[PDB]
Coordinates of C-alpha atoms and ligand atoms in Angstrom, one line a residue:
Chain F
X742 CA -71.4 -170.2 178.1
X743 CA -70.9 -172.4 175.0
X744 CA -67.7 -174.4 174.8
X745 CA -66.4 -172.0 172.1
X746 CA -66.5 -169.1 174.4
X747 CA -64.6 -170.9 177.3
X748 CA -61.9 -172.2 175.0
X749 CA -61.4 -168.6 173.8
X750 CA -61.2 -167.3 177.4
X751 CA -58.5 -170.1 178.0
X752 CA -56.3 -169.0 175.1
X753 CA -56.8 -165.3 176.1
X754 CA -55.3 -166.0 179.5
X755 CA -52.7 -168.5 178.3
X756 CA -51.4 -165.9 175.9
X757 CA -51.4 -163.1 178.5
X758 CA -49.8 -165.5 181.0
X759 CA -46.8 -166.1 178.7
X760 CA -46.2 -162.4 178.2
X761 CA -46.6 -161.4 181.8
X762 CA -44.3 -163.7 183.7
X763 CA -40.5 -164.1 183.0
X764 CA -39.9 -167.8 183.5
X765 CA -42.7 -170.1 182.4
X766 CA -43.2 -173.5 183.8
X767 CA -42.3 -175.4 180.6
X768 CA -38.9 -173.7 180.5
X769 CA -38.3 -174.2 184.2
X770 CA -39.1 -177.9 183.9
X771 CA -36.7 -178.3 181.0
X772 CA -34.0 -176.6 183.1
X773 CA -34.5 -178.7 186.2
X774 CA -34.8 -182.1 184.3
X775 CA -31.7 -181.3 182.3
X776 CA -33.1 -181.4 178.8
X777 CA -31.9 -177.9 177.7
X778 CA -26.4 -173.9 179.5
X779 CA -26.6 -175.3 183.1
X780 CA -27.7 -173.0 186.0
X781 CA -25.1 -171.8 188.4
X782 CA -25.7 -173.9 191.5
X783 CA -25.9 -172.5 195.1
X784 CA -25.3 -175.2 197.7
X785 CA -23.4 -173.5 200.5
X786 CA -22.1 -170.2 201.8
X787 CA -19.0 -170.0 199.5
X788 CA -21.0 -170.6 196.3
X789 CA -23.6 -167.9 197.1
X790 CA -20.7 -165.5 197.8
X791 CA -19.6 -166.4 194.2
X792 CA -23.0 -166.3 192.6
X793 CA -23.6 -162.7 193.8
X794 CA -20.4 -161.5 192.2
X795 CA -21.1 -163.6 189.1
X796 CA -24.9 -163.6 188.5
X797 CA -25.0 -160.0 190.1
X798 CA -28.1 -159.8 192.2
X799 CA -30.0 -156.5 192.4
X800 CA -31.0 -156.5 196.1
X801 CA -27.4 -156.3 197.4
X802 CA -26.3 -153.3 199.6
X803 CA -24.8 -158.2 206.4
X804 CA -25.4 -161.7 207.8
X805 CA -25.8 -164.7 205.4
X806 CA -29.3 -165.9 206.3
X807 CA -30.7 -162.3 206.3
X808 CA -29.3 -161.7 202.8
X809 CA -31.1 -164.8 201.5
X810 CA -34.2 -163.7 203.3
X811 CA -34.1 -160.2 201.8
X812 CA -33.4 -161.4 198.2
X813 CA -36.7 -163.3 198.4
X814 CA -38.5 -160.2 199.5
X815 CA -37.0 -158.4 196.5
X816 CA -38.3 -161.1 194.2
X817 CA -41.8 -161.1 195.8
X818 CA -42.2 -157.3 195.3
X819 CA -41.2 -157.9 191.7
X820 CA -43.8 -160.7 191.3
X821 CA -46.5 -158.5 192.8
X822 CA -46.1 -156.0 189.9
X823 CA -46.1 -159.0 187.5
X824 CA -49.4 -160.4 188.9
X825 CA -50.9 -156.9 189.0
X826 CA -50.2 -156.6 185.3
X827 CA -51.6 -160.0 184.5
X828 CA -54.9 -159.2 186.3
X829 CA -55.6 -156.4 183.9
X830 CA -56.2 -158.9 181.1
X831 CA -58.7 -161.0 183.1
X832 CA -61.9 -160.2 181.1
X833 CA -64.0 -158.0 183.4
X834 CA -61.3 -157.2 186.0
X835 CA -60.5 -153.6 184.9
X836 CA -64.2 -152.8 185.0
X837 CA -64.5 -153.4 188.7
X838 CA -64.8 -150.7 191.3
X839 CA -61.3 -149.6 191.8
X840 CA -61.3 -150.3 195.5
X841 CA -62.4 -153.9 194.8
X842 CA -59.5 -154.2 192.4
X843 CA -57.0 -153.0 195.0
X844 CA -58.5 -155.4 197.6
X845 CA -58.5 -158.5 195.3
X846 CA -54.8 -158.1 194.6
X847 CA -53.9 -157.1 198.2
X848 CA -55.3 -160.4 199.4
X849 CA -54.5 -162.7 196.5
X850 CA -50.8 -162.1 195.8
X851 CA -49.4 -164.3 198.5
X852 CA -51.5 -167.3 197.4
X853 CA -50.4 -166.7 193.8
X854 CA -46.8 -166.2 194.7
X855 CA -46.8 -169.5 196.6
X856 CA -48.5 -171.2 193.7
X857 CA -46.2 -169.9 190.9
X858 CA -43.2 -170.5 193.1
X859 CA -44.0 -174.2 192.8
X860 CA -43.3 -173.9 189.1
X861 CA -39.6 -173.1 189.8
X862 CA -39.2 -175.8 192.5
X863 CA -38.5 -179.5 192.7
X864 CA -37.7 -181.9 195.6
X865 CA -34.1 -180.7 195.7
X866 CA -34.0 -176.9 195.1
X867 CA -35.4 -173.9 193.3
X868 CA -34.6 -172.0 190.1
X869 CA -33.6 -168.3 190.5
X870 CA -32.8 -165.3 188.2
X871 CA -35.0 -166.4 185.3
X872 CA -33.4 -169.9 185.4
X873 CA -29.8 -168.8 185.4
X874 CA -29.4 -170.0 189.0
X875 CA -30.3 -173.0 191.2
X876 CA -30.4 -172.8 195.0
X877 CA -30.4 -176.2 196.8
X878 CA -33.2 -177.0 199.2
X879 CA -30.7 -178.6 201.5
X880 CA -28.9 -175.3 201.8
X881 CA -32.1 -173.2 202.3
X882 CA -33.5 -175.7 204.9
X883 CA -30.2 -175.6 206.9
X884 CA -30.1 -171.8 207.5
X885 CA -30.1 -170.8 211.2
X886 CA -32.6 -170.0 214.0
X887 CA -35.8 -168.7 212.3
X888 CA -34.7 -168.5 208.7
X889 CA -34.4 -172.3 208.2
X890 CA -38.0 -173.2 209.1
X891 CA -39.3 -170.2 207.0
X892 CA -38.0 -171.7 203.8
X893 CA -38.8 -175.4 204.0
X894 CA -42.7 -175.2 204.1
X895 CA -42.5 -173.7 200.6
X896 CA -40.7 -176.8 199.3
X897 CA -43.1 -179.0 201.2
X898 CA -46.1 -177.3 199.6
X899 CA -44.6 -177.3 196.0
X900 CA -43.8 -181.0 196.2
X901 CA -47.4 -181.8 196.9
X902 CA -48.7 -179.2 194.4
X903 CA -46.4 -180.3 191.5
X904 CA -47.8 -183.9 191.9
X905 CA -50.9 -182.5 190.2
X906 CA -48.7 -182.1 187.1
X907 CA -50.4 -178.9 185.8
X908 CA -48.9 -177.0 182.9
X909 CA -49.0 -173.2 182.0
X910 CA -52.3 -173.4 180.2
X911 CA -53.9 -174.9 183.4
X912 CA -52.1 -172.4 185.7
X913 CA -53.1 -169.3 183.7
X914 CA -56.7 -170.0 184.5
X915 CA -56.2 -171.2 188.1
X916 CA -54.4 -168.0 188.9
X917 CA -57.2 -165.9 187.4
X918 CA -59.5 -167.9 189.6
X919 CA -57.6 -167.1 192.8
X920 CA -57.6 -163.3 192.1
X921 CA -61.4 -163.2 191.6
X922 CA -62.3 -164.4 195.1
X923 CA -65.5 -162.9 196.4
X924 CA -64.7 -163.5 200.0
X925 CA -61.8 -161.1 200.4
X926 CA -62.5 -158.8 203.4
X927 CA -64.0 -155.5 202.6
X928 CA -65.1 -155.8 199.0
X929 CA -67.9 -153.4 198.2
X930 CA -69.7 -155.2 195.3
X931 CA -69.2 -158.9 195.4
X932 CA -71.7 -160.0 192.7
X933 CA -69.7 -159.2 189.5
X934 CA -66.5 -160.8 191.0
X935 CA -68.3 -164.0 191.6
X936 CA -69.8 -163.7 188.1
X937 CA -66.3 -163.6 186.7
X938 CA -65.1 -166.4 189.0
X939 CA -68.0 -168.6 187.9
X940 CA -66.8 -167.9 184.3
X941 CA -63.2 -168.8 185.1
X942 CA -64.2 -171.9 187.1
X943 CA -66.2 -173.0 184.0
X944 CA -63.1 -172.4 181.9
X945 CA -60.9 -174.2 184.4
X946 CA -63.2 -177.3 184.5
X947 CA -63.2 -177.7 180.7
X948 CA -59.5 -177.0 180.2
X949 CA -58.6 -179.8 182.7
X950 CA -60.9 -182.4 181.1
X951 CA -59.5 -181.7 177.7
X952 CA -55.8 -181.4 178.8
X953 CA -55.9 -184.3 181.3
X954 CA -58.7 -186.7 180.1
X955 CA -57.1 -189.5 182.2
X956 CA -57.0 -187.7 185.5
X957 CA -60.2 -188.4 187.4
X958 CA -61.7 -185.4 189.2
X959 CA -58.6 -183.3 188.8
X960 CA -60.8 -180.2 188.9
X961 CA -62.0 -181.1 192.4
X962 CA -58.5 -182.0 193.6
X963 CA -57.0 -178.7 192.5
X964 CA -59.8 -176.8 194.2
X965 CA -59.0 -178.6 197.4
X966 CA -55.4 -177.2 197.1
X967 CA -56.8 -173.7 197.4
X968 CA -58.0 -175.0 200.8
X969 CA -54.4 -176.0 201.6
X970 CA -53.2 -172.6 200.1
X971 CA -55.2 -170.6 202.7
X972 CA -53.3 -172.4 205.5
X973 CA -49.7 -171.8 204.3
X974 CA -50.3 -168.1 203.7
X975 CA -51.6 -167.6 207.3
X976 CA -48.6 -169.6 208.6
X977 CA -46.4 -167.4 206.5
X978 CA -47.4 -164.0 208.0
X979 CA -47.3 -165.3 211.5
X980 CA -43.8 -166.3 210.6
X981 CA -43.1 -162.9 209.1
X982 CA -44.5 -161.3 212.3
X983 CA -42.1 -163.3 214.4
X984 CA -38.9 -162.5 212.3
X985 CA -39.5 -158.7 212.7
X986 CA -39.7 -158.7 216.5
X987 CA -36.2 -160.4 216.6
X988 CA -34.2 -159.7 213.5
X989 CA -33.7 -156.6 211.3
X990 CA -33.4 -152.0 207.4
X991 CA -33.4 -148.3 205.9
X992 CA -36.6 -146.3 206.5
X993 CA -37.2 -145.7 202.8
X994 CA -36.8 -149.5 202.2
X995 CA -39.4 -150.3 204.9
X996 CA -42.1 -148.4 203.0
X997 CA -41.5 -150.5 199.9
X998 CA -41.7 -153.9 201.6
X999 CA -44.5 -152.7 203.9
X1000 CA -47.0 -155.6 204.0
Chain E
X550 CA -39.8 -145.3 169.7
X551 CA -43.0 -146.9 171.2
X552 CA -46.1 -147.3 169.1
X553 CA -48.9 -144.9 169.9
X554 CA -51.2 -147.6 171.3
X555 CA -48.5 -148.8 173.6
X556 CA -47.9 -145.3 175.0
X557 CA -51.6 -144.6 175.6
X558 CA -51.6 -147.9 177.5
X559 CA -48.8 -146.7 179.7
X560 CA -50.8 -143.5 180.4
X561 CA -53.9 -145.4 181.4
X562 CA -51.8 -147.7 183.6
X563 CA -50.2 -144.8 185.4
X564 CA -53.4 -142.7 185.8
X565 CA -55.0 -145.8 187.3
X566 CA -52.2 -146.2 189.9
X567 CA -52.4 -142.5 190.7
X568 CA -56.1 -142.7 191.5
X569 CA -55.5 -145.7 193.7
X570 CA -52.4 -144.6 195.6
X571 CA -53.3 -140.9 196.4
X572 CA -56.5 -140.3 198.4
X573 CA -57.3 -136.7 197.5
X574 CA -57.2 -136.3 193.7
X575 CA -57.0 -132.9 192.0
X576 CA -60.5 -133.2 190.4
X577 CA -62.0 -133.6 193.9
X578 CA -59.8 -130.8 195.3
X579 CA -61.0 -128.4 192.6
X580 CA -64.6 -129.4 193.4
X581 CA -64.2 -128.4 197.0
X582 CA -62.3 -125.1 196.3
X583 CA -64.8 -124.0 193.6
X584 CA -67.6 -124.8 196.0
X585 CA -71.2 -124.6 194.6
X586 CA -71.7 -127.8 196.6
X587 CA -73.2 -128.3 200.1
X588 CA -71.7 -131.6 201.2
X589 CA -68.2 -130.9 199.9
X590 CA -67.7 -127.8 202.0
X591 CA -64.6 -126.8 204.0
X592 CA -64.3 -125.3 207.4
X593 CA -62.0 -122.3 206.9
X594 CA -59.2 -121.6 209.4
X595 CA -58.1 -117.9 209.3
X596 CA -57.1 -117.1 213.0
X597 CA -56.7 -118.7 216.4
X598 CA -60.4 -118.5 217.3
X599 CA -61.0 -120.4 214.0
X600 CA -58.1 -122.8 214.8
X601 CA -59.4 -123.7 218.2
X602 CA -62.9 -124.4 216.9
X603 CA -62.0 -126.3 213.7
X604 CA -60.1 -128.8 215.9
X605 CA -63.5 -129.8 217.4
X606 CA -65.0 -129.7 213.8
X607 CA -62.4 -131.0 211.4
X608 CA -60.8 -133.4 213.9
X609 CA -47.6 -123.0 220.6
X610 CA -49.6 -122.6 217.3
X611 CA -46.9 -122.3 214.7
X612 CA -45.0 -125.3 216.1
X613 CA -48.2 -127.5 216.0
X614 CA -48.9 -126.4 212.4
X615 CA -45.2 -127.1 211.6
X616 CA -45.6 -130.5 213.2
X617 CA -48.9 -131.2 211.5
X618 CA -47.2 -130.7 208.0
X619 CA -44.4 -133.1 208.8
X620 CA -46.8 -135.8 210.0
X621 CA -48.7 -135.1 206.7
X622 CA -45.5 -135.2 204.6
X623 CA -44.6 -138.7 206.0
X624 CA -48.0 -139.8 204.8
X625 CA -47.3 -138.4 201.3
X626 CA -44.0 -140.2 201.2
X627 CA -45.7 -143.5 201.9
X628 CA -48.3 -142.7 199.1
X629 CA -45.5 -141.8 196.6
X630 CA -43.5 -144.9 197.5
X631 CA -46.5 -147.0 196.8
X632 CA -47.1 -145.1 193.5
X633 CA -43.4 -145.7 192.5
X634 CA -43.7 -149.5 192.9
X635 CA -46.1 -149.5 189.9
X636 CA -44.0 -147.5 187.5
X637 CA -43.2 -150.3 185.1
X638 CA -39.5 -151.0 185.5
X639 CA -39.1 -149.4 188.9
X640 CA -39.1 -152.5 191.1
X641 CA -36.5 -154.1 188.9
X642 CA -33.8 -151.5 189.3
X643 CA -30.9 -152.0 191.6
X644 CA -32.4 -151.7 195.1
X645 CA -30.0 -148.9 196.0
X646 CA -30.9 -147.0 192.9
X647 CA -34.6 -147.3 194.0
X648 CA -33.8 -145.8 197.4
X649 CA -31.8 -143.0 195.6
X650 CA -34.5 -142.2 193.2
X651 CA -37.0 -141.9 196.1
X652 CA -34.6 -140.1 198.5
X653 CA -34.3 -137.2 196.0
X654 CA -37.6 -137.4 194.2
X655 CA -40.2 -137.2 197.0
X656 CA -39.9 -133.5 197.9
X657 CA -40.2 -132.5 194.2
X658 CA -43.4 -134.6 194.1
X659 CA -45.0 -133.4 197.3
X660 CA -44.6 -129.7 196.1
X661 CA -46.2 -130.6 192.7
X662 CA -49.1 -132.5 194.3
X663 CA -49.5 -129.8 197.0
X664 CA -50.3 -127.3 194.3
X665 CA -53.4 -129.4 193.6
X666 CA -54.7 -128.5 197.1
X667 CA -54.0 -124.8 196.6
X668 CA -55.4 -121.6 195.2
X669 CA -54.3 -118.0 195.6
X670 CA -55.9 -117.8 199.0
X671 CA -55.2 -121.1 200.9
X672 CA -54.8 -124.8 201.1
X673 CA -57.0 -127.8 201.8
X674 CA -56.1 -129.8 204.9
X675 CA -57.4 -133.0 206.6
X676 CA -58.5 -134.7 203.3
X677 CA -60.5 -131.6 202.2
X678 CA -62.5 -131.0 205.3
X679 CA -60.4 -128.0 206.2
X680 CA -59.0 -125.0 204.4
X681 CA -56.2 -122.8 205.8
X682 CA -55.8 -119.3 204.4
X683 CA -52.4 -118.3 203.0
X684 CA -52.6 -115.0 204.9
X685 CA -52.7 -116.8 208.2
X686 CA -49.8 -119.1 207.6
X687 CA -47.9 -116.2 206.2
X688 CA -48.6 -114.4 209.5
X689 CA -46.9 -117.0 211.7
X690 CA -44.0 -115.9 213.8
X691 CA -40.1 -115.9 213.7
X692 CA -38.9 -118.1 210.8
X693 CA -42.1 -120.2 210.4
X694 CA -44.1 -117.4 208.6
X695 CA -41.7 -117.4 205.6
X696 CA -41.7 -121.2 205.6
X697 CA -45.2 -121.6 204.3
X698 CA -45.6 -119.0 201.6
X699 CA -43.1 -120.2 198.9
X700 CA -45.3 -123.2 198.4
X701 CA -48.2 -120.9 197.5
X702 CA -46.0 -118.9 195.2
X703 CA -44.8 -121.8 193.2
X704 CA -48.2 -123.4 193.2
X705 CA -50.0 -120.4 191.7
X706 CA -47.6 -120.4 188.7
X707 CA -47.7 -124.2 188.3
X708 CA -51.5 -124.4 188.4
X709 CA -51.7 -121.9 185.6
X710 CA -50.7 -124.7 183.3
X711 CA -54.2 -126.3 184.1
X712 CA -53.1 -129.9 184.2
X713 CA -55.3 -132.7 185.3
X714 CA -54.6 -135.9 187.2
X715 CA -54.2 -137.8 184.0
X716 CA -51.4 -135.4 183.1
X717 CA -49.8 -135.3 186.6
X718 CA -49.7 -139.1 187.0
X719 CA -47.2 -139.2 184.1
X720 CA -45.2 -136.0 185.0
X721 CA -44.9 -137.4 188.5
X722 CA -43.5 -140.7 187.1
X723 CA -41.0 -138.8 184.9
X724 CA -39.7 -137.0 188.0
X725 CA -39.1 -140.2 190.0
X726 CA -37.1 -141.7 187.1
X727 CA -34.4 -139.0 186.8
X728 CA -31.1 -140.4 185.8
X729 CA -29.2 -137.4 187.2
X730 CA -29.7 -138.2 190.9
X731 CA -26.5 -138.4 193.0
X732 CA -25.0 -141.8 193.5
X733 CA -27.1 -143.9 191.0
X734 CA -25.2 -147.1 190.0
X735 CA -26.9 -147.8 186.6
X736 CA -28.0 -144.6 184.9
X737 CA -28.7 -146.2 181.5
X738 CA -31.7 -148.4 182.6
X739 CA -33.2 -145.4 184.5
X740 CA -33.0 -143.2 181.4
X741 CA -34.4 -146.1 179.4
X742 CA -37.6 -146.0 181.5
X743 CA -37.7 -142.2 181.5
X744 CA -37.5 -142.0 177.7
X745 CA -40.7 -144.0 177.6
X746 CA -42.4 -141.9 180.3
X747 CA -41.3 -138.7 178.4
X748 CA -42.7 -140.2 175.2
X749 CA -45.9 -141.1 177.1
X750 CA -46.1 -137.6 178.6
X751 CA -45.6 -135.7 175.3
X752 CA -48.5 -137.6 173.6
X753 CA -50.9 -137.3 176.6
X754 CA -50.4 -133.6 176.6
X755 CA -50.6 -133.2 172.8
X756 CA -53.9 -135.1 172.9
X757 CA -55.4 -133.8 176.2
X758 CA -54.3 -130.1 175.5
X759 CA -54.3 -129.8 171.7
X760 CA -54.8 -126.0 171.9
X761 CA -51.9 -125.6 174.3
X762 CA -48.8 -124.3 172.5
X763 CA -45.7 -126.2 173.7
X764 CA -47.3 -127.4 176.9
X765 CA -44.9 -130.3 177.0
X766 CA -41.9 -128.0 176.7
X767 CA -43.3 -125.6 179.3
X768 CA -44.1 -128.4 181.7
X769 CA -40.5 -129.8 181.6
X770 CA -39.3 -126.3 182.3
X771 CA -41.3 -126.4 185.6
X772 CA -38.9 -129.2 186.8
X773 CA -36.3 -126.3 186.8
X774 CA -38.2 -124.4 189.5
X775 CA -38.9 -127.5 191.6
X776 CA -35.2 -128.2 191.9
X777 CA -34.7 -124.7 193.4
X778 CA -37.5 -124.8 195.9
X779 CA -36.4 -128.0 197.4
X780 CA -33.0 -126.3 198.0
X781 CA -34.6 -123.3 199.6
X782 CA -36.8 -125.6 201.7
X783 CA -34.1 -127.8 203.1
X784 CA -31.9 -124.7 203.8
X785 CA -34.8 -123.1 205.8
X786 CA -35.4 -126.3 207.8
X787 CA -31.7 -126.4 208.7
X788 CA -32.0 -122.9 210.0
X789 CA -35.1 -123.6 212.1
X790 CA -33.4 -126.5 213.7
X791 CA -30.5 -124.4 215.0
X792 CA -33.3 -122.1 216.5
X793 CA -36.1 -124.5 217.7
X794 CA -34.3 -127.3 219.6
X795 CA -37.5 -128.7 221.1
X796 CA -38.5 -129.7 217.7
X797 CA -38.0 -133.2 216.3
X798 CA -38.2 -134.6 212.8
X799 CA -39.6 -137.9 211.7
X800 CA -37.0 -140.7 211.0
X801 CA -38.2 -141.2 207.5
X802 CA -38.0 -137.4 206.8
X803 CA -34.8 -137.3 208.8
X804 CA -33.4 -140.0 206.5
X805 CA -34.3 -138.2 203.3
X806 CA -32.6 -134.9 204.4
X807 CA -29.2 -136.2 205.6
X808 CA -28.0 -136.4 202.0
Ligands
LIG2397 C1 -30.9 -165.9 198.3 S1 -31.2 -165.1 196.7 O1 -31.3 -163.7 197.0 O2 -30.2 -165.5 195.8 C2 -32.8 -165.6 196.2 C3 -33.4 -165.0 195.2 C4 -34.7 -165.4 194.7 C5 -35.3 -166.5 195.3 C6 -36.6 -167.0 194.8 O3 -37.7 -166.7 195.6 C7 -38.9 -166.5 195.0 C8 -39.1 -166.4 193.6 C9 -40.3 -166.2 193.0 C10 -40.5 -166.1 191.5 O4 -39.4 -166.3 190.8 O5 -41.6 -166.0 191.0 C11 -41.4 -166.0 193.8 C12 -41.3 -166.1 195.2 C13 -40.1 -166.3 195.8 C14 -40.0 -166.5 197.2 N1 -40.7 -165.8 198.0 N2 -40.5 -166.2 199.3 C15 -41.2 -165.7 200.4 O6 -40.7 -165.7 201.5 C16 -42.5 -165.1 200.2 C17 -43.6 -165.8 199.6 CL1 -43.3 -167.6 199.4 C18 -44.8 -165.3 199.4 C19 -45.0 -164.0 199.6 C20 -44.0 -163.2 200.1 C21 -42.8 -163.7 200.4 C22 -41.7 -162.8 200.9 F1 -42.0 -161.5 200.7 F2 -41.4 -163.0 202.2 F3 -40.5 -162.9 200.3 C23 -39.7 -167.3 199.3 C24 -39.3 -168.1 200.4 C25 -38.4 -169.2 200.0 C26 -38.1 -169.4 198.7 CL2 -37.0 -170.8 198.4 C27 -38.5 -168.6 197.7 C28 -39.3 -167.5 198.0 C29 -34.6 -167.2 196.3 C30 -33.4 -166.7 196.8
LIG2398 C1 -51.9 -127.3 211.0 S1 -52.4 -128.9 210.5 O1 -51.7 -129.9 211.2 O2 -53.8 -128.9 210.5 C2 -51.9 -129.0 208.8 C3 -51.8 -130.2 208.2 C4 -51.5 -130.3 206.8 C5 -51.1 -129.2 206.1 C6 -50.8 -129.3 204.7 O3 -49.4 -129.4 204.4 C7 -49.1 -130.2 203.4 C8 -50.0 -131.1 202.9 C9 -49.6 -132.1 201.9 C10 -50.7 -133.0 201.4 O4 -51.9 -132.9 201.8 O5 -50.3 -133.8 200.5 C11 -48.3 -132.1 201.5 C12 -47.4 -131.2 202.0 C13 -47.7 -130.3 203.0 C14 -46.7 -129.4 203.5 N1 -45.5 -129.8 203.8 N2 -44.8 -128.7 204.2 C15 -43.4 -128.8 204.6 O6 -42.9 -127.9 205.3 C16 -42.7 -130.0 204.1 C17 -42.7 -130.3 202.8 CL1 -43.5 -129.3 201.6 C18 -42.0 -131.4 202.3 C19 -41.4 -132.2 203.1 C20 -41.3 -132.0 204.5 C21 -42.0 -130.9 205.0 C22 -41.9 -130.6 206.5 F1 -41.7 -131.7 207.2 F2 -40.9 -129.8 206.8 F3 -43.0 -130.0 207.0 C23 -45.5 -127.5 204.1 C24 -45.2 -126.2 204.3 C25 -46.2 -125.2 204.0 C26 -47.5 -125.7 203.6 CL2 -48.7 -124.5 203.2 C27 -47.8 -127.0 203.4 C28 -46.8 -127.9 203.6 C29 -51.2 -127.9 206.8 C30 -51.5 -127.9 208.1

């Protein structure tokens, strides 16, 4: 692969990335820093009870920490259809065996949600509703019994991840790399998936050297994050499993949020 | 007004979710029913002697058949639910509108998709391994005999249109997104999505059945009939319940009906 072909693959994903996802990282960083119609801030129970009436949330039908929990699930399901659509533009993806496509997404969406969620997060809280809102980390971390400790590990990850200082052109490729993992359980034909990931890895390597020439071994250091990424996704589901056996939904709803 | 290229994209997107969400396609089901094959060959159930043997093979009578359908309907509801999540726009509607669209739309879609498993003489069962003759079901006792046949009756008429899975994937999507369901909160954005699916359905049919005079018009007129048979169906279940008190329904099905 000559440099000309990789740079082309980079723009192809960067362009598709911009179209697929509602709030890019460049906009979210301008909002958080304060360089841009301020977001409505959620810092306690009373302000959330206001933000729902104001910034009318679509997941509203209930106890406070549960409602926060379920609004996240609503946003996750949405992001899953967003990532699914982005995958279709990864050169090669739509030519995979259809079962391999379903498998790659089934297993990759949590690591990619966790990743892109770092784009909307800083030390102190997280952007919501396409940047219209801001929910403080102090508030999320303070929620009761299980719900408090379910929220904080996200902020903890994102603070470490954001130290890498990636932008949207870096992330468009890094995301494509996650999807095309050849070690997902039960793939039928691994070779062409590794073939594509070897191509994206090549595109990721070059992008980083061009876009961060002063950041020694940034490529290696981001690949070690995918190590870290495997751990929080496991933690996550073993924390989901625990919520269910204690806390609470409508049978039709349960099918949507299944898995 | 969407550009032709954008619509055709929507068709391919939906056909692809259809192949992925539903296990027994219509193309496969017509391959079994036609026959001419040795491996794709159903065990036929036409009486009790055949029923007692197929259980070993395919692995009171009318009750167990009644119960087998409901277990199978629950499965189809989970399959349709997963399909709904990929209809572009669906997961972004008001959550209660989502439940409403599904609550009313699943029966209309099972009946449509059950016609794929049907010819004048019977129905595939157990993912195509089995086949149950219409005559036998029609011969079941008390109320249960007349419970099975109206499916065959609608299905023979519907299948005369000769649609394939690329046509049905869109027609199914159009059904889910009906803005005239009881109790929707935001009718406008549901219609907005349905106008695009209608647009996508018209073109697909005009291209895939160019020798079919007014196939689009005739196919929308089938949505008339479907509305009636769900009424008939739920009113015959209600009557069976006041007769067969042993019998229990599935909570997910139980939730859909109470409406
Ligand atoms: C209380 S509200 O209704 O006003 C409310 C609405 C919206 C949010 C923002 O949340 C997210 C936004 C995007 C996005 O914009 O791309 C992506 C993810 C989340 C989010 N997912 N998530 C999970 O638990 C989770 C995760 Cl990580 C991975 C997979 C599945 C899940 C699931 F399914 F369990 F949900 C969070 C936990 C904490 C926080 Cl802080 C955010 C998230 C917050 C509050
Ligand atoms: C005796 S068995 O266990 O081997 C057995 C298993 C499976 C069948 C096939 O049946 C179906 C298969 C599929 C499918 O494959 O997608 C889809 C639907 C039905 C089916 N549902 N149904 C109902 O009454 C019904 C319906 Cl439509 C909608 C909602 C709820 C119900 C419920 F709950 F009231 F039941 C039928 C009635 C007659 C016939 Cl002919 C078929 C069906 C047959 C035998």
